[PDB]
Write a protein that binds this ligand. Structure first.
Ligand SMILES: Nc1ncnc2c1ncn2[C@@H]1O[C@H](COP(=O)(O)OP(=O)(O)NP(=O)(O)O)[C@@H](O)[C@H]1O
Ligand SMILES: Nc1ncnc2c1ncn2[C@@H]1O[C@H](COP(=O)(O)OP(=O)(O)NP(=O)(O)O)[C@@H](O)[C@H]1O
Ligand SMILES: O=C(C[C@H]1NCCC[C@@H]1O)Cn1cnc2cc(Br)c(Cl)cc2c1=O
Ligand SMILES: O=C(C[C@H]1NCCC[C@@H]1O)Cn1cnc2cc(Br)c(Cl)cc2c1=O
Ligand SMILES: [Mg+2]
Ligand SMILES: [Mg+2]
Ligand SMILES: [Mg+2]
Ligand SMILES: [Mg+2]
Lengths: 399, 399
């Protein structure tokens, strides 16, 4: 099976739910697990989350947010301050039954806010801006789907507290725009910003052409003073007003991002990676291979190109495995969605050129080796915006 | 309490266990949590883990290791292939009792290796080199201690599989040396490499001067073929030998690293941060402050210095809060272990110099502003090696 060619066995436009399973399995993104609704994130899909993590982590740090880590556990009575058929319960640990069951966090408000109440002694302690990258568990009763609705998933959740409503409201929309940027500028997915235990909730919605539905892609909550009154997160007003309750937001985005990417950009040849989150942006494949002197000169030139592409900060890799055919390589990296295949054979070598095959469109482009690296940087940008505009044109048609 | 001065209330050499609690609380490293043996990682301590994570993640990627994410859950019968009084058990989820309890992973061998068995169809599928940054849970029956022995902790665990014993054994010792480098070159802690369900186990041991004990700082396992026979991770030998079982290692380091740092470098003034894992390496504090024209010229020069230190890639920050005294600032950043305080007042300003106060030793150094940034880069190196050599001299004395 591994060293054999592979086909997406059903068309996206015929049965998208079965097509979806084909793509995520044949592109080596997940493994099914014997605990239902949990899925292994294989490196090919986990790398996409790492790119999102690295980007968003840099952006919120510019806003003053610091990372932390709160516990996985919340006691039953602490959870039930302020859904119940979605909680996993620990009732035994070590050698003893617990007198009170412990919940796995489905979200961390009731884990974090007793500490926020302790940390806020005066307005000088505000703002508090904390984020954590972590796993949460929701025993989802709707049917689980890899990435889109899983019972364990990875996310970040940010939890912020301010001395005034206006600071908090301003951050809600900055965060919301950062979430839109993840979809638009990292995943090439157009989104709409909209207002859905808080004062107001805003999401980014990603339209899915094949079924006409919208993916709730991330959530930004303005909690007002609802949680700060619940947990007594308060300070003395400097201007005589007495006890003032902190103004709070929380916000989160998950590995559902990766399911949106599959649903929207996947096609009948398999995954199509948005270039900015592709762990391999360009795969270099030797083609048309006799002569010992020729095979060396050709592989040596491929190594040169590979180094020149990485010098230009392109994530290029070379596939010079000889126990497997070029045609198998084409198919493997197509199924996995590598944005560009660079083919180099004897004919192209003699013309000091390569042949680039663009995955999302199938276009073949012959390019001189001279200014190649710069031409490839441009091409990866071209692909990103073309992927985006193609979905945007589909959405602005149905709407 | 927050805007007041604070003292470590008991000496390290008098009661190190109570001294330890003083330091980790007053340096804002942790919060105690109402589930026993779990502790909040506040930003000041979580940033240390982030530095270790970023460094080690870069090193194992050079060895070909890829990141992934396997589930939190392992079914009872899968765990009990191959300690029991240390497992947290889920017995109810959503609306139903489970027919079989689910364990929180205490480690991920039994979560991962059924997938390894599926992925290894031939020797061409090897090596497999996977790592995950994640949380695990052990209901530790010995008494829990922040960082050193917690019931939830963060770690990485790497799990590798090779076609030959020699490849696997070579990686065991490369990983072990990377763990030694974390202690030696990031935390300024000398370690000894030693050989403790595997074929052999190697650890790095950090000597703790105040009580004479050794911290098991990380673990590198050579599993041989024990787990690959258990899980049938095997391939056909190309040379006629028949079924061959993969040769496996696993290896892990946790947030226990941070407890070693506190135990070994902490002193009676509080935390002392090894410079290479200090989120603030240098804190700039205006001292000796009347004149509106003078206060601006002094804060403006401090901002200049701060920018020049960051241009040199030094993690400098400026503390120009005016609602709190310089003496409070000295004490706050000492308790938190900032490697160097840079004091600038009117007298130094007129001599175009600053006064640096080195935290681990108390030494005060007057330095011209001219070549300051380069002098500070050197100083942070000097501090790292001096911290290391001071502990090494203590260990080579007791031994
Ligand atoms: N089970 C899940 N699996 C994966 N991602 C999820 C899951 N539930 C929520 N998310 C994502 O996490 C984000 C923040 O969480 P949250 O606001 O609590 O979601 P939610 O209101 O429960 N959404 P939903 O269940 O789809 O109606 C959401 O915007 C989703 O994109
Ligand atoms: N409860 C814990 N809290 C924090 N770190 C831990 C804990 N248990 C183990 N570690 C660390 O994780 C590393 C890898 O885990 P592992 O090899 O399974 O530890 P171990 O054999 O159970 N050690 P120990 O319990 O101290 O005898 C160890 O080398 C420790 O440094
Ligand atoms: O999880 C939330 C609110 C916000 N938390 C921080 C990240 C962004 C997120 O939108 C809403 N929510 C969603 N699902 C839940 C499921 C359960 Br089970 C519980 Cl107890 C609670 C909740 C619950 O509070
Ligand atoms: O966890 C290990 C072996 C290795 N796993 C990968 C990271 C490095 C680590 O040394 C040993 N170990 C330690 N403690 C355990 C506690 C329980 Br509970 C269980 Cl079931 C199993 C174990 C168990 O297997
Ligand atoms: Mg208060
Ligand atoms: Mg939900
Ligand atoms: Mg096999
Ligand atoms: Mg143990």
């Amino acid at each position: 099976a591994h060293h054999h060619h592979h086909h997406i066995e059903i068309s996206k436009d015929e049965n998208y739910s079965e097509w979806y399973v084909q793509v995520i399995t044949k592109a080596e993104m997940i493994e099914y697990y014997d605990i239902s609704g949990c899925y292994v994130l294989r490196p090919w899909s986990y790398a996409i989350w790492e790119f999102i993590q690295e980007w968003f982590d840099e952006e919120i740090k510019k806003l003053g947010v610091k990372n932390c880590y709160f516990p996985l556990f919340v006691s039953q009575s602490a959870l039930e301050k302020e859904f119940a058929p979605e909680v996993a319960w620990i009732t035994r640990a070590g050698q003893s039954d617990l007198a009170e069951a412990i919940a796995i966090r489905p979200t961390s408000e009731t884990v974090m806010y007793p500490s926020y109440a302790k940390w806020v002694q005066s307005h000088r302690d505000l703002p508090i801006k904390l984020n954590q990258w972590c796993n949460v568990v929701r025993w989802e009763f709707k049917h689980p789907t890899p990435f889109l609705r899983t019972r364990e998933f990875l996310w970040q959740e940010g939890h912020t507290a301010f001395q005034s409503k206006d600071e908090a409201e301003d951050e809600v929309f900055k965060i919301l725009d950062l979430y839109a940027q993840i979809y638009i500028d990292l995943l090439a997915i157009p989104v709409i910003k909209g207002r859905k235990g808080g004062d107001f909730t805003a999401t980014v919605e990603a339209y899915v052409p094949v079924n006409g539905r919208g993916i709730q892609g991330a959530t930004s909550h303005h909690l007002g003073q609802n949680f700060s009154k619940m947990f007594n997160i308060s300070f003395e007003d400097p201007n005589g007003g007495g006890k003032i309750y902190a103004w709070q937001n929380s916000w989160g985005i998950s590995t559902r991002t990766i399911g949106a990417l599959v649903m929207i950009h996947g096609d009948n040849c398999g995954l199509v990676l948005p270039p900015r989150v592709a762990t391999i942006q360009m795969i270099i494949v030797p083609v048309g291979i006799t002569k010992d002197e020729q095979k060396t000169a050709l592989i040596e030139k491929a190594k040169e190109i590979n180094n020149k592409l990485m010098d230009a900060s392109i994530r290029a890799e070379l596939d010079i495995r000889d126990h497997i055919s070029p045609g198998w390589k084409f198919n493997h990296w197509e199924l996995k969605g590598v944005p560009v295949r660079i083919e180099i054979g004897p004919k192209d070598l003699a013309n000091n050129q390569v042949t680039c095959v663009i995955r999302y469109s199938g276009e073949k482009r012959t390019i001189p080796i001279d200014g190649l690296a710069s031409k490839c940087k441009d091409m990866l940008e071209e692909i990103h915006y073309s992927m985006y505009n193609r979905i945007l044109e589909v959405r602005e048609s149905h709407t």
